[PDB]
Specification:
Radius of gyration of chain B: 31 Å
Strand content of chain B: 15-25%
Largest interface: A-B, 32 and 32 residues
Number of strands of chain B: 22
Structural class of chain B: alpha/beta
Subcellular location (chain C): Cell projection, Dendritic spine; Cell membrane; Synapse; Postsynaptic cell membrane
Shape of chain B: elongated
Helix content of chain B: 25-40%
Strand content of chain A: 15-25%
Protein name (chain C): Glutamate receptor ionotropic, NMDA 2A
Radius of gyration of chain A: 29 Å
Oligomer: part of a larger assembly
Subcellular location (chain B): Cell membrane; Postsynaptic cell membrane; Postsynaptic density membrane; Synaptic cell membrane
Helix content of chain A: 25-40%
Distance between the termini of chain A: 88 Å
Extracellular side (chain B): 1-473
Strand order of the largest sheet of chain A: 2-1-3-4-5
Family (chain C): Belongs to the glutamate-gated ion channel (TC 1.A.10.1) family. NR2A/GRIN2A subfamily.
């Protein structure tokens, strides 16, 4: 019946009044005639919180609190918990301090927030580690709170997995401005793909040493979660390119959408009430009195906040009150230092990626050990399988290879499908990776197979040589004149010629 | 120069303690620099901040210091003023509290204590290990932040010296029928139990177990200090090992040591550069200090040798390292001081431990049962399984040379197909392992209690639903 | 191959080179005062392991 929205100055209440009436025009009306008032300040001061929220208690006993905020003090939202100590009202935390969750909850708390959850943080981290196959880990930490807990999730989610995530143990940057004890630890770094759970100002120091470490090379990788990235609009210098994070950064979501979302969640709680009960839990008498009790005899909304679905989108909760399907934007910096869209998670907890693999191109500025190879399907030099559901996509002998898959013949776009790759040539290349020792990358051909003079214009492997789509071509390539006319050749790999097969 | 210090108290004689401690700080260890401010506890949690903003923050207070309450056990936990400090990351030393939910520096920014939480009591039991030589632990835990943190510091101190606990049990507070868990209990080898809970829970527990007859000789009770309080004092068995943090409740000595810590903290802040000026209004300020973590680092890295309590050095988590501990015993319902600890150095008192069951000798929780549960798998010739007689007994038959075959009763299901009801039947058994274990009987003195597999398979790891959780079959 | 500490008091270019060290048994052709600096960094390098 009574819902209030309290916001800061951005896009304004008139369109939010349209949002409230459109929520009353969209779908499934609360029998309950819901009146919503949105009001505005720019304070985050607790005096305001007291006055305004007790005035919301004054006018017709408002049962819902709506807060998206645009400052940077965090336990402000935990300030609202004291509101839950005094009012016992469901509260939906939307932005700012209401977003940046580290908030461990009372059993008496009533807070449901669209911010980051360390479990789901780590799981989306690890599926990022899944699809781009960085199976060696460096696990470098500090001793802020919850970071022992990050270590716990790392150890446990590795041990629970049949992947064979191949580890170094946790190396623990202990205190600040060690500056040579940091060196004592960080010179023990001996891997390729790197994970920090740190702070802002610590990562400043860490990467300032890391350029001096020579671990800021542009074959390395660095994925750090939201607590260091955070403010996308504030871009500090010493961070190199290509760094990877996950956060709820609004690039696609309006404020008003999530406003109507939380209001609809409140109405679903109202509907679950008037199903399994038949009345309304009326609000408290006032703020200022201590009179008789705090018995929630009307059984407040926590069994009622369990299953809430809107609009084809599941918005339920756990026992901890975290969100089962949040929105989870996956972000990388490019060369202009722009936090840009890369990975999306709106679908059944799965990841949707652009597959732009190497983009780190010396921001901290030449390197050419990435090699481009595109090959053909000839057994048993080459056998290609698809991805098996074997707790991962990494088989003991296969290497993934991106095909282009057509949509139809009228749109010639090809989707980069990772597939499993076997045979002679790949085993040869792995032995080259242990002898020649570089980084090796694989693809597959559509344009003919080997090469054909199309009025002296090549197809196939040979055309991929000529027009420099790839540097290297392996195949079981027959070694012949017009082929030797254009390109150079290794000492012949295996022996062939012309034979005759008969019964 | 003008440095303002805030406080929350009960009786105004301790406000006088603050003022004369300010004068002591003017004296002990060079122009004019100090002024005193304090406002007592409220009965309400309603406004709070209005005193804090309008009184202490308006007076540019660097530190507010708060004791418990004039209720000493209530839910009046000094939450909101800490959060008003958390608006501007303002340092507060938790004077008297032990509720370790305040302990996380994430949620509770700068609230460092002179009194340790119950967590370090966990480490005390490790100290007990080194005198009383155990290996096997029973843990009973309240489902708290506190109980889980107790568990975690237990597990870390177990796996820094590789001692390995057997079970951990969980408890919702206020539940009353517990009995299966304590039976649960009586099943195991160890007889050393640690409780971490509230009072009523424990009484609940202490009395309940006494019925479950777990308080006699051969039992155990490692007990936190809230479980050594009032009603918990009335219905536990005597002879339970207990603890006190020494100097637990006279507020004033801790007040004085705190004010002295604050004073040399102020001077060592004045030693530094780019010193910032303190804000007054809450109205018009969302701006954090430049020097919040500098307050923190000065409070962390400081040393204070000659306090009332002695050395006051803080953890990485910022509460007192190496404080003095005492072990007590209610023997004939009177507490007797037994144990003395600087931080780790162990002193028993020469009054002797009446161990709270039988005799004053120190037991062992290593006692077996010799009734060993064995499971067999249907594989000829290593295992033969045949049904019984109509008696339910086993036939008497021969070997090839005619020896009487040793045969074993085995319970298990008939219909060993998946998706079917399974029905417990005793059946006769042959094989190697029978004869092996009877050789082990005549060498080793056990009894042998034999089952079939519930599944009729070996058992490997598979993933159950959500496709990440491994379980052995 | 030869890794070449070029000039004196580089102090981070020395770091650029000496963090490329990936071996067990080490040879220096240096001076007195240079080896002072080099082993002073080498304790910080963690290459003064025993």
């Amino acid at each position: 019946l009574n819902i209030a929205v309290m916001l800061g100055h951005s896009h304004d209440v008139t369109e939010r009044e349209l949002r409230t009436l459109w929520g009353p025009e969209q779908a499934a009306g609360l029998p309950l005639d819901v009146n919503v008032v949105a009001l505005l300040m720019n304070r985050t001061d607790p005096k305001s919180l007291i006055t305004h929220v007790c005035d919301l208690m004054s006018g017709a006993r408002i049962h819902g609190l709506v807060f998206g905020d645009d400052t940077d003090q965090e336990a402000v939202a935990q300030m609202l918990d004291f509101i839950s100590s005094h009012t016992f009202v469901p509260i939906l935390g939307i932005h700012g301090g209401a977003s940046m969750i580290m908030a461990d909850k009372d059993p008496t708390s009533t807070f449901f927030q669209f911010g980051a959850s360390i479990q789901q943080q780590a799981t989306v981290m690890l599926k990022i580690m899944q699809d781009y196959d960085w199976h060696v880990f460096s696990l470098v930490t500090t001793i802020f709170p919850g970071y022992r807990e990050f270590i716990s999730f790392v150890k446990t989610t590795v041990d629970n997995s049949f992947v064979g995530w191949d580890m170094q143990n946790v190396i623990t940057l202990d205190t600040s401005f060690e500056d040579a004890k940091t060196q004592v630890q960080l010179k023990k770094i001996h891997s390729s793909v790197i994970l920090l759970y740190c702070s802002k100002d610590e990562a400043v120091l860490i990467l300032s040493e890391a350029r001096s470490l020579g671990l800021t090379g542009y074959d390395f990788f660095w994925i750090v979660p939201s607590l260091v990235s955070g403010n996308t609009e504030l871009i500090p210098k010493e961070f190199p390119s290509g760094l990877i994070s996950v956060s709820y950064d609004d690039w696609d979501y309006s404020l008003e959408a999530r406003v109507r979302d939380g209001i609809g969640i409140l109405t679903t709680a109202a509907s679950s009430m008037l199903e399994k009960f038949s009345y309304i839990p009326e609000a408290k008498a006032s703020c200022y009195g201590q009179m008789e009790r705090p018995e929630v005899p009307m059984h407040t909304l926590h069994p009622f906040m369990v299953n809430v679905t809107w609009d084809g989108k599941d918005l339920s909760f756990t026992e901890e009150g975290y969100q089962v399907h949040p929105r989870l934007v996956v972000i990388v910096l490019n060369k202009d230092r722009e936090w840009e869209k890369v990975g999306k998670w709106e679908n059944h907890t799965l990841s949707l990626r652009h597959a732009v693999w190497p983009r780190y191109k010396s921001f901290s500025d030449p390197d050419d050990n990435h090699l481009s190879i595109v090959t053909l399907e000839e057994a048993p030099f080459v056998i290609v399988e698809d991805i098996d559901p074997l707790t991962e996509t990494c088989v003991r002998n296969t290497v993934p290879c991106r095909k282009f898959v057509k949509i139809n013949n009228s749109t010639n776009e090809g989707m980069n499908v990772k597939k499993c790759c076997k045979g002679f040539c790949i085993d040869i290349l792995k032995k080259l990776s242990r002898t020649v020792k570089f980084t090796y990358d694989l693809y597959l051909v559509t344009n003919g197979k080997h090469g054909k003079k199309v009025n002296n214009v090549w197809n196939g492997m040979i055309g991929e040589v000529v027009y420099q789509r790839a540097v290297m071509a392996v195949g079981s390539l027959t070694i012949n004149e017009e082929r030797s006319e254009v390109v150079d050749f290794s000492v012949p790999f295996v022996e062939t010629g012309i034979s005759v097969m008969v019964s | 120069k003008i440095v303002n210090i805030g406080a929350v108290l009960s009786t105004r004689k301790h406000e006088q303690m603050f003022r004369e401690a300010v004068n002591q700080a003017n004296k002990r260890h060079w122009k004019i620099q100090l002024n005193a401010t304090s406002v007592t506890h409220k009965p309400n949690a309603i406004q709070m901040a209005l005193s804090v903003c309008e009184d202490l923050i308006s007076s540019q207070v660097y530190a507010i210091l708060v004791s418990h309450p004039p209720t000493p056990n209530d839910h009046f936990t000094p939450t909101p003023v800490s959060y008003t400090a958390g608006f501007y990351r303002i340092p507060v030393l938790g004077l008297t509290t032990r509720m370790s939910i305040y302990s996380d520096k994430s949620i509770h920014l700068s609230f460092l204590r002179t009194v340790p939480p119950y967590s370090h009591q966990s480490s005390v039991w490790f100290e007990m290990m080194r005198v009383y030589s155990w290996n096997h632990i029973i843990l009973l835990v309240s489902d708290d932040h506190e109980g889980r943190a107790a568990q975690k510091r237990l597990e870390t101190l177990l796996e820094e010296r590789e001692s390995k606990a057997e079970k951990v049990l969980q408890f919702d507070p206020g539940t009353k029928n517990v009995t299966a868990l304590l039976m649960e209990a009586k099943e195991l080898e160890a007889r050393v139990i640690i409780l971490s809970a509230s009072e009523d829970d424990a009484a609940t527990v202490y009395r309940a177990a006494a019925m479950l007859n777990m308080t006699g000789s051969g039992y155990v009770w490692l007990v936190g200090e809230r479980e050594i309080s009032g009603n918990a004092l009335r219905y536990a068995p005597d002879g339970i090992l207990g603890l006190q943090l020494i100097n637990g409740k006279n507020e004033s000595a801790h007040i004085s040591d705190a004010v002295g810590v604050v004073a040399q903290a102020v001077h060592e802040l004045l030693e530094k550069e780019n010193i910032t000026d303190p804000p007054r209004g809450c109205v018009g300020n969302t701006n954090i200090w430049k020097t919040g973590p500098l307050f923190k680092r000065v409070l962390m890295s400081s040393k204070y040798a000659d306090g009332v309590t002695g050395r006051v050095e803080f953890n990485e988590d910022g509460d007192r390292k190496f404080a003095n501990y005492s072990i007590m015993n209610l023997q004939n319902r009177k507490l007797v001081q037994v144990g003395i600890y600087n931080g780790t150095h162990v002193i028993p008192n020469d009054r002797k431990i009446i161990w709270p069951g039988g005799e004053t000798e120190k037991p062992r929780g290593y006692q077996m049962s010799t009734r060993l549960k064995i499971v067999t798998i249907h594989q000829e010739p290593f295992v033969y399984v045949k049904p019984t007689l109509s008696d339910g007994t086993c036939k008497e038959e021969f070997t090839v040379n005619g020896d009487p075959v040793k045969k074993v009763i085995c319970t298990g299901p008939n219909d060993t197909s998946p998706g079917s009801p399974r029905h417990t039947v005793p059946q006769c058994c042959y094989g190697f392992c029978i004869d092996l274990l009877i050789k082990l009987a005549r060498t080793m003195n056990f009894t042998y209690e034999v089952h079939l597999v519930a599944d009729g398979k070996f058992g490997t790891q598979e993933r159950v639903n959500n496709s990440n959780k491994k379980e052995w079959n």
